[PDB]
Design a protein around this ligand. Structure first.
Ligand SMILES: NC(=O)c1ccc[n+]([C@@H]2O[C@H](COP(=O)([O-])OP(=O)(O)OC[C@H]3O[C@@H](n4cnc5c(N)ncnc54)[C@H](O)[C@@H]3O)[C@@H](O)[C@H]2O)c1
Ligand SMILES: NC(=O)c1ccc[n+]([C@@H]2O[C@H](COP(=O)([O-])OP(=O)(O)OC[C@H]3O[C@@H](n4cnc5c(N)ncnc54)[C@H](O)[C@@H]3O)[C@@H](O)[C@H]2O)c1
Ligand SMILES: O=C(O)/C=C/c1c[nH]cn1
Ligand SMILES: O=C(O)/C=C/c1c[nH]cn1
Lengths: 545, 545
């Protein structure tokens, strides 16, 4: 029987802050792409190191007092420590390796030995809310491209992408919300069907000709459509190049970061991957890397024929370069090219979860946002769209990109709504780690920083320490695993709006500092949007020169 | 005019917790090996990124309120954030680079660009107390060797080492406190004289024959002696091999971790190093690496002739291997070979500083320890020796290795002594980062862990987050710079015992968790001393299997 988050108002823990974390753990497994292996998303991002660790985490949370801290180490609960009730209930650090040892080869060996797990960004910290977590980011990428290259509209524009997994599955809905005709190549029919049946996906086919006919009809009419094509991206993309078909936009969101558990090489059936991992994992990686190289060569050709081509944050260019595509980094990254003006003001992927399990709670917050942020036409547009079109996945939840001060405003209003019984139960707040002071990754978040600080990992470490100092409920530091090993370090944070007045202080303190450090990180690198935000919001940026 | 720590009881800041950190900053510069370059020790471990950063840190500390946190990033003050008064006053993260970019070459380039500094372990967190900080560790190494190989006594035993810098300068006194005849090779006459005049060193010479005559007379009589020999270790060590002279113990504590600013190659004069760094830094590194290789070859030969040979934590074996010494790691590391049974109980380099500047404060704490820990003959022996023989360096301070619960006991007694006026002024507590949950370094602290977890850097990240959650005054996360780039990540903590009852809670909470996580880190790796300590001290170690 599949794990699901507890619904309703019956506490299993000593309080609602503890219960919230337990339900978020259950919720990432409920929305997980392979719950049975503790895998939440991204092929091998796990919620805990193993089932023994999971059960001991669950036991510990049920007995944890508000003035204690549980320490979790690469997904394994280690000990319980006395702190105080304005300190995190959990601090965790997942898959951190000292630099010269931070290689994929070392990662697999240590995971085999039982010593670590990769936590993804939001898997091991239990902050994943389903595909919705990434859908506004992708939609904002598509809209930024529209503004930059297509007069503000993707109507009649053709997007090609691949991957309909935990995160990739958001792309068809992001595409059609932006008015685009979007073709998503996916190797697993199982995944195609899942997205069809949750209505992230409109149409499916096994025929490329049929898919292109549908795309053509939509483009010609300026209608949106999403098509899932069963196939391998390293076969389909070169074929479009052969046919001289250049989409207007091309990206990829396959699991290219991991050549053992992620990217399916050309000529392999999904059914034989386990077999291949067991017998000859080395050949499988070589085959996956060669197929990624073919796919990116096709992307590069599409780029030269005029497509807007970009990396959607999966190290696909890094992999392609390793397997011989020397100009792979001619392809843009979505951060530097499209979203960095948002990050520079610490506008980022803020999210919240209705721990009661009641969708009416999300809808009440939706209505609050439309009323209280009505001068913010971006968030107002997004919330209208999400309320109408994003289905419930696990616990009702909402993604909503907010910047400095706005996160705090929302969370304080919601906490009061919990306190006043306008919401049925407490609300958990969190975010992706793809946020201003909380991620360092030279080929994703921090590629080509203005000051060259691409590799500086101080910032997420600072974000974690400051958030611990700011009364958050859960704080985490992650580093890359699998093919992300050695590429990134990030930090996450969870807050529980349980209605109490003491939570008001925690929410205010953490959220102002979580975004505040984000603004200063980009201000330090010389971004003028950040310097403007500092003045607008009276952030205390220290001047030295 | 040289920077010195303020003495006396006049506050320059808004409170004594803030003043304590300001004085510790001044104090590491006062005891610094090259204050003029902000360099505290270890060739390039700096207290701040640059003088502009230093002045802005000083200004900020003078105005910082107890409910605020200053964020420092690789030695540069970034911003001031509202937290609460049971949160750190400072969180800092120094010289952290994502793994694939954590190389010495990247480090130098980024330091050149003005983007980072190496913080050492205790330099950028202002936790260095002078040479005393390391002297008990070295003495415990020598005593462990004595127990293992020489019937409990180094009387009549010959120790050969090199390096009389910030940390290396402790070796002659550690040697003679243990009864040994110790020869210290040092290239700079300036350094030799400094140690002579602070009485860390008994005798100096420029003649190897004279040095060996002195060593021989002492050995023969079972007397202790310390001799500083002006010379290059890569010349002297092979010469002893040539002469068939095998000391009983051989180590090195030169700055072998950095081939640009540290290790002086054979045939270079110290006077020309600056010139060489400017013109041809690449040749200088090659020359330094070749000379380290020669020195370690000599060490390896001495080992085969029966010397107890070990690496004293300066990556000398790593460097030697890189420059061709394939069996360099046949030489023991002091952690795994001698001190790990202490680390396994979180016994570690705890230290405290009399912020009043009054030596009588240290002496009162000394007397307290002798009375309150009298069943602990190890600490009782050490304190007697240190009070008698360790000179004051900068602010009066004391090193004293204590384990779980004992650190807390000491700090609570001292805080009460501050409160009751038995001490003139507040006391700062800290430690080296060479401590149980606070250091990851596969070729120093965590070489050859029982469970193979040598590379896992989760633990210092956890130590920092938990200490932030535990009401510490300053928390830091550092990673390696120079030749340490990619090798290590560590965490430090500072507490201010200012006498208040609220500080009692902070000191208790932080110290129990700083050592408590340390015990659990070694317990997790399977060390039986740790499992014993857990039971003895009722540490809440979670069981999963
Ligand atoms: N680290 C970041 O900053 C960041 C941010 C957002 C997304 N992501 C990345 O998004 C990528 C995907 O995330 P996920 O959660 O969707 O992964 P997931 O593994 O759940 O799904 C990956 C999908 O790709 C399919 N696939 C694999 N090889 C294929 C091929 N050759 N052709 C077609 N389809 C193929 C798989 O069948 C699966 O459905 C990952 O690399 C994740 O890291 C990363
Ligand atoms: N990272 C750890 O875990 C740890 C712990 C303790 C000590 N240490 C290391 O101890 C080593 C020294 O620390 P420090 O603070 O003494 O450095 P320091 O640079 O102040 O002094 C180094 C001394 O070595 C001398 N020297 C350089 N090359 C020489 C040569 N070829 N022959 C003789 N003398 C030579 C220099 O003149 C200087 O006096 C460093 O590598 C530091 O990291 C490291
Ligand atoms: O939105 C999430 O939960 C995760 C986003 C992400 C991207 N890459 C890894 N995790
Ligand atoms: O005792 C100190 O202050 C520093 C010890 C240390 C060892 N290596 C780097 N710092």
């Amino acid at each position: 029987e599949r794990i699901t988050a507890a619904r309703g108002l019956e506490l299993r823990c000593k309080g609602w802050r503890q219960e919230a974390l337990l339900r978020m753990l259950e919720n990432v497994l409920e929305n997980g792409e392979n719950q049975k292996e503790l895998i939440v998303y991204a092929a091998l991002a796990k919620a805990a190191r193993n089932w023994p660790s999971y059960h001991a985490i669950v036991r510990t949370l049920k007995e944890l007092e508000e003035d204690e801290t549980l320490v979790i180490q690469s997904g394994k609960p280690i000990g319980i420590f006395k702190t105080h009730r304005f300190a995190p209930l959990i601090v965790m650090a997942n898959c951190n390796l000292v630099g010269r040892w931070a290689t994929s080869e070392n990662f697999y060996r240590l995971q085999e030995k039982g010593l670590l797990i990769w936590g993804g960004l939001t898997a091991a910290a239990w902050q994943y809310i389903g595909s919705q977590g990434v859908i506004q980011g992708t939609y904002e990428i598509f809209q930024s491209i529209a503004r930059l290259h297509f007069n503000g509209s993707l109507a009649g524009k053709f997007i090609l992408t691949a991957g309909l997994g935990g995160m990739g599955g958001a792309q068809p809905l992001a595409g059609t919300l932006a008015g685009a005709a979007i073709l998503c190549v996916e190797v697993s029919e199982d995944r195609v069907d899942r997205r069809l049946q949750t209505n992230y996906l409109q149409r499916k086919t096994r025929s490329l000709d049929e898919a292109l006919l549908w795309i053509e009809e939509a483009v010609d009419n300026l209608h949106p459509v999403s098509v899932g094509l069963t196939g391998n991206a390293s076969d389909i993309y070169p074929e479009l190049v052969r046919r001289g078909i250049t989409p207007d936009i091309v990206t990829d969101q396959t699991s290219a970061h991991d050549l053992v558990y992620g990217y399916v090489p050309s000529g392999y059936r999904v059914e034989e991957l386990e077999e291949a991992r067991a017998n000859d994992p080395e050949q499988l990686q070589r085959d996956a890397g060669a197929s990624i190289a073919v796919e990116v060569e096709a992307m590069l050709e599409l780029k030269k024929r005029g497509a807007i081509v970009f990396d959607n944050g999966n190290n696909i260019r890094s992999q392609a370069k390793e397997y011989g595509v020397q100009n792979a980094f001619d392809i843009d990254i979505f951060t530097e090219a499209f979203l960095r003006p948002l990050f520079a003001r610490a506008i980022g992927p803020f999210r919240w979860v209705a721990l009661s399990g009641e969708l009416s709670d999300i809808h009440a917050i939706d209505e609050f946002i439309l009323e209280a942020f009505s001068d913010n036409e971006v968030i107002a547009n997004w919330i209208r769209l999400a309320r109408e079109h994003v289905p419930v996945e696990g616990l009702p939840a909402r993604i909503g990109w907010f910047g400095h001060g706005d996160r705090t405003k929302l969370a304080l209003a919601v906490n009061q709504m919990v306190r006043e019984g306008k919401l049925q139960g407490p609300i958990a707040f969190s975010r992706d780690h793809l946020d201003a002071a909380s991620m360092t990754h030279p080929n994703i978040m921090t590629e080509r920083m203005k000051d060259g600080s691409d590799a500086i990992a101080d910032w997420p470490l600072l974000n974690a320490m400051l958030n611990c100092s700011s009364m958050a409920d859960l704080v985490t530091i992650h580093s890359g695993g699998g093919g992300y090993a050695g590429y990134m370090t990030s930090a996450g944070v969870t807050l529980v709006a349980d209605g109490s007045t003491e939570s008001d202080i925690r929410l205010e303190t953490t959220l102002n500092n979580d975004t505040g450090l984000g603004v200063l990180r980009y201000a330090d690198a010389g971004y003028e949007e950040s310097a403007d935000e500092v003045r607008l919001k009276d952030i205390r940026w220290i001047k030295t020169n």
